[PDB]
Amino acid sequence: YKIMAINASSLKFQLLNMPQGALQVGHRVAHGGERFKDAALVDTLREIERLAELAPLHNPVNALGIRLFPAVPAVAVFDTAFHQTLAPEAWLYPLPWRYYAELGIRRYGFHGTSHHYVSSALAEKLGVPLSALRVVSCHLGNGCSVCAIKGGQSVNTSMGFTPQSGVMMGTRSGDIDPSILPWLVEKEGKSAQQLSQLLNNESGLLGVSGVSSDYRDVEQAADAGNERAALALSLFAERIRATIGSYIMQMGGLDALIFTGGIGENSARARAAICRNLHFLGLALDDEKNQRSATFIQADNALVKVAVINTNEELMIARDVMRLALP
Amino acid sequence: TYKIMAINAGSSSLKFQLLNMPQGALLCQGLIERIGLPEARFTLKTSAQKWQETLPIADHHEAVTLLLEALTGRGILSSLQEIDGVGHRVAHGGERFKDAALVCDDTLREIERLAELAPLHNPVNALGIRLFRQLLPAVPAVAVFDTAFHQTLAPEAWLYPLPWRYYAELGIRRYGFHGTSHHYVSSALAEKLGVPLSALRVVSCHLGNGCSVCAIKGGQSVNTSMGFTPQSGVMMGTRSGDIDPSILPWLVEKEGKSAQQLSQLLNNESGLLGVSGVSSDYRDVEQAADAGNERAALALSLFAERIRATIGSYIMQMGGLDALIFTGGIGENSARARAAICRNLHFLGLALDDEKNQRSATFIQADNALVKVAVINTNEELMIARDVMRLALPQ
Numbered sequence: 001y002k003i004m005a006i007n008a009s010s011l012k013f014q015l016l017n018m019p020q021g022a023l024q025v026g027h028r029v030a031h032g033g034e035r036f037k038d039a040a041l042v043d044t045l046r047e048i049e050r051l052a053e054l055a056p057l058h059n060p061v062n063a064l065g066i067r068l069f070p071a072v073p074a075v076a077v078f079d080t081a082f083h084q085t086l087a088p089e090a091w092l093y094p095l096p097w098r099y100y101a102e103l104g105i106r107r108y109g110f111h112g113t114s115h116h117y118v119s120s121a122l123a124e125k126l127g128v129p130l131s132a133l134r135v136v137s138c139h140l141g142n143g144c145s146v147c148a149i150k151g152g153q154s155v156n157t158s159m160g161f162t163p164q165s166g167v168m169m170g171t172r173s174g175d176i177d178p179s180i181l182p183w184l185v186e187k188e189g190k191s192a193q194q195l196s197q198l199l200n201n202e203s204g205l206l207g208v209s210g211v212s213s214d215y216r217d218v219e220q221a222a223d224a225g226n227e228r229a230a231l232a233l234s235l236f237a238e239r240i241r242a243t244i245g246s247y248i249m250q251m252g253g254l255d256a257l258i259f260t261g262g263i264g265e266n267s268a269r270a271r272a273a274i275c276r277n278l279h280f281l282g283l284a285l286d287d288e289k290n291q292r293s294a295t296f297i298q299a300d301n302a303l304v305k306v307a308v309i310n311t312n313e314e315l316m317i318a319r320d321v322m323r324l325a326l327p
Numbered sequence: 328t329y330k331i332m333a334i335n336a337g338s339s340s341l342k343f344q345l346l347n348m349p350q351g352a353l354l355c356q357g358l359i360e361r362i363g364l365p366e367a368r369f370t371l372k373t374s375a376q377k378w379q380e381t382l383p384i385a386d387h388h389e390a391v392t393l394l395l396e397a398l399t400g401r402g403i404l405s406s407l408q409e410i411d412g413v414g415h416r417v418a419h420g421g422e423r424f425k426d427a428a429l430v431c432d433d434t435l436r437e438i439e440r441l442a443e444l445a446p447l448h449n450p451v452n453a454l455g456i457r458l459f460r461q462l463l464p465a466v467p468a469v470a471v472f473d474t475a476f477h478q479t480l481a482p483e484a485w486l487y488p489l490p491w492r493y494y495a496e497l498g499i500r501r502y503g504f505h506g507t508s509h510h511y512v513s514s515a516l517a518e519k520l521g522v523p524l525s526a527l528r529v530v531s532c533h534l535g536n537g538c539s540v541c542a543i544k545g546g547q548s549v550n551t552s553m554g555f556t557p558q559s560g561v562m563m564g565t566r567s568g569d570i571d572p573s574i575l576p577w578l579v580e581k582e583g584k585s586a587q588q589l590s591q592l593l594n595n596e597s598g599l600l601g602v603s604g605v606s607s608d609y610r611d612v613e614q615a616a617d618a619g620n621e622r623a624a625l626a627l628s629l630f631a632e633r634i635r636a637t638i639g640s641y642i643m644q645m646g647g648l649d650a651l652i653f654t655g656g657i658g659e660n661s662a663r664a665r666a667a668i669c670r671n672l673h674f675l676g677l678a679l680d681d682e683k684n685q686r687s688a689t690f691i692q693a694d695n696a697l698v699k700v701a702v703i704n705t706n707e708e709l710m711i712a713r714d715v716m717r718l719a720l721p722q
């Protein structure tokens with residue numbers, strides 16, 4: 001009836017009146033590898049901390065948070081689990097096979113909790129089974145990812161081996177020509193970590209704009225005439241548009257596009273730039289609705305629903321300790 | 328009727344074609360290979376005959392000399408004056424060259440300046456231009472750049488989301504390659520269709536050992552899959568294409584790969600060869616798969632998905648699609664790959680005609696389809712000769 005959501009130099013918490021969702025136990029785990037295709041009742045501790053081998057600075061913090069927290073069932077909820085329905089063609093990188101079979105390098109995806117939440121939130125609003133829709137959902141925040149949901153399963157998503165890749169984000173470059181990296185090492189003697197910092201901490205909106213990691217900040221610099229900030233927002237939109245384009249291709253069409261996250265739920269600019277000239281899909285926004293961020297913002301003529309859904313990952317975590325620990 | 332020669336000088340290669348212009352008739356073609364190395368071979372073919380001689384070819388200066396004396400000694404040319412212009416393929420023109428250039432003194436220094444970015448090719452490409460200008464002083468020469476075609480891309484398409492300094496100080500951006508090929512089949516499509524290219528939204532798929540896809544809208548490249556170097560974009564023969572950049576620091580921090588080994592992992596050990604473990608030739612991977620090799624079959628399916636994904640990006644960029652072009656050794660011949668690539672595109676009115684695709688006909692789309700799907704043999708030497716005759720013989 002009353003469950004709590006833990007997210008471990010930090011310890012976010014939130015207790016909810018379940019199942020009404022009323023309100024600042026289940027445990028957010030950053031990487032479940034391939035072992036956890038779903039949220040797991042908690043031995044589970046020891047294969048959580050083992051996969052720390054691929055989520056070093058997040059996995060053991062979360063699994064020690066599970067230990068600190070008796071007689072209360074705990075469910076571990078893995079940001080990666082939603083994406084374990086991807087086929088090999090979606091998660092195998094064209095590297096030498098041994099890099100996957102002996103080192104576990106493959107696309108994994110993250111934000112799986114939020115994508116799962118908002119996609120079925122969307123289905124409930126339309127009154128149809130999620131499996132009846134072809135959905136692209138964009139979680140757009142400090143981190144950003146796109147996700148393609150078809151027949152109720154995630155079939156692709158933009159973050160790869162680590163949460164650094166995919167679309168452009170606040171400080172993460174997203175995907176870039178990989179051959180840039182051996183060039184940077186041989187021209188600026190960048191160490192493995194400096195490269196890693198370059199990609200994770202000074203790229204994206206921050207590196208392009210020179211102003212800020214924050215969309216709202218960059219958007220003010222660009223309206224006051226800053227050219228690098230204006231370009232930044234443009235490239236931001238384009239990265240996400242190209243990714244959406246891949247996923248529509250993969251699914252053979254599109255029934256609904258979902259925006260969420262700090263930018264997705266609030267930025268009328270981001271959403272209008274991202275949806276520009278898509279009449280060939282039957283997608284168009286309505287200015288008035290887009291502007292007040294109504295739940296559905298598509299034009300009445302439009303064939304593709306466009307939804308602005310606020311993601312609530314603690315409430316989604318709640319609904320899983322209720323399902324696997326007190327059924 | 329002019330006699331134009333197209334030249335492509337590799338690090339140890341010297342490919343060449345002699346064309347009768349402006350018809351396009353091929354008089355002779357050939358390759359000098361293993362230059363400097365032992366095993367140096369010279370092959371020369373015309374319509375009728377073929378000549379091949381293993382013999383010591385020291386430097387490129389000696390490859391060019393055997394080429395010129397063979398043209399007269401095989402009765403191909405009556406004299407070397409008969410040659411009206413030489414066009415040279417050049418790997419990387421950076422931002423300086425938006426088009427093919429008549430070879431100046433300035434053109435050649437500007438080309439060696441860009442060696443910074445195409446180190447294994449640009450220096451030797453310029454070597455070819457110099458040797459020919461010495462050995463054929465009277466003949467005009469034109470540089471044709473693999474990037475030039477993509478110089479019509481906008482910032483939001485060639486800027487990588489790195490710190491600005493990385494572009495404004497080290498020139499790191501998407502350049503794109505295969506310009507000459509995409510240019511050529513773009514424009515061939517518009518001829519064979521009787522429409523002007525300004526009127527079409529085209530996606531062009533050069534699928535060979537290297538593979539790239541290119542979005543042409545209103546007559547211009549507006550995006551292309553290869554970025555900073557020809558390693559990136561879709562999956563290829565032994566090139567990985569685009570992967571997660573964070574894999575690279577991981578592998579350096581974990582396996583200790585130098586900058587050079589990362590380049591070889593990405594360029595020579597990945598792709599079709601990396602995934603199938605079989606080979607880098609699409610045909611040999613395909614034989615392996617139909618024999619039951621699951622990795623080979625996986626490799627052919629990943630290859631198709633990576634190309635579908637890029638097409639998807641560019642179709643969205645242009646607001647639709649009017650024609651899809653398949654070229655290169657795989658695009659031109661593999662009805663299977665074209666089929667796997669075009670499946671379930673009813674959302675764009677795109678559908679293939681099986682009988683036409685099996686024959687590799689010129690248009691393979693289905694009868695009720697809204698999108699034209701063309702199978703066009705790329706012909707970069709022809710594209711080069713046309714640029715030589717545009718800029719070196721304006722009459």
Ligand SMILES: Nc1ncnc2c1ncn2[C@@H]1O[C@H](COP(=O)(O)OP(=O)(O)NP(=O)(O)O)[C@@H](O)[C@H]1O
Nearest residue numbers: 140141142143144213214215216261262263266267
């Ligand atoms: N009203 C707004 N208008 C525009 N952008 C906004 C607005 N509010 C927040 N943002 C942006 O969205 C970000 C907040 O995203 P948020 O979803 O809270 O991130 P997060 O979930 O805490 N971290 P992550 O899970 O990695 O995305 C801010 O840093 C701003 O860039």
Ligand SMILES: Nc1ncnc2c1ncn2[C@@H]1O[C@H](COP(=O)(O)OP(=O)(O)NP(=O)(O)O)[C@@H](O)[C@H]1O
Nearest residue numbers: 534535536537538607608609610655656657660661
């Ligand atoms: N009949 C065929 N069916 C399928 N694949 C084929 C066929 N013939 C050739 N290929 C493939 O075509 C590939 C390369 O063709 P080609 O385009 O000539 O290479 P290339 O021009 O030397 N390098 P590049 O132009 O950069 O792609 C080979 O690696 C084969 O896998």
Ligand code: NA
Nearest residue numbers: 149150151152
């Ligand atoms: Na679905």
Ligand code: NA
Nearest residue numbers: 158165166167
């Ligand atoms: Na992403």
Ligand code: NA
Nearest residue numbers: 167168174175
């Ligand atoms: Na990106």
Ligand code: NA
Nearest residue numbers: 249250252671
């Ligand atoms: Na499809």
Ligand code: NA
Nearest residue numbers: 335336416452
């Ligand atoms: Na050359």
Ligand code: NA
Nearest residue numbers: 477478479480
């Ligand atoms: Na450009």
Ligand code: NA
Nearest residue numbers: 474477478502
């Ligand atoms: Na270019």
Ligand code: NA
Nearest residue numbers: 503504539553
């Ligand atoms: Na390219």
Ligand code: NA
Nearest residue numbers: 475476506507
């Ligand atoms: Na070009």
Ligand code: NA
Nearest residue numbers: 476479547548
């Ligand atoms: Na162009």
Ligand code: NA
Nearest residue numbers: 539552560561
């Ligand atoms: Na490519």
Ligand code: NA
Nearest residue numbers: 562567568569
């Ligand atoms: Na790739």
Ligand code: NA
Nearest residue numbers: 277644645646
């Ligand atoms: Na568009």
Ligand code: NA
Nearest residue numbers: 252671673674
């Ligand atoms: Na379809």
